[PDB]
């Protein structure tokens, strides 16, 4: 998840958009 | 825009700069 996503590894501003509403 | 390890509290935050009046969902797994 989002965590895996950008905690663990690394992640862009542009991923984090896929959790807006 | 760069790339980031983003974790806890922080995450929340970069979630609230990007998503803002859409309002967003963390759901931690
Ligand atoms: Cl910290
Ligand atoms: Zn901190």
Do not use: D, M, W
Request: net charge negative; with cysteine.
């Amino acid at each position: 998840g989002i965590v895996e996503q950008c905690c663990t590894s690394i992640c862009s501003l542009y991923q984090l958009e896929n959790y807006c509403n | 825009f760069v790339n980031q390890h983003l974790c806890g509290s922080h995450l929340v935050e970069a979630l609230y700069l990007v998503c803002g009046e859409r309002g967003f969902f963390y759901t931690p797994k």
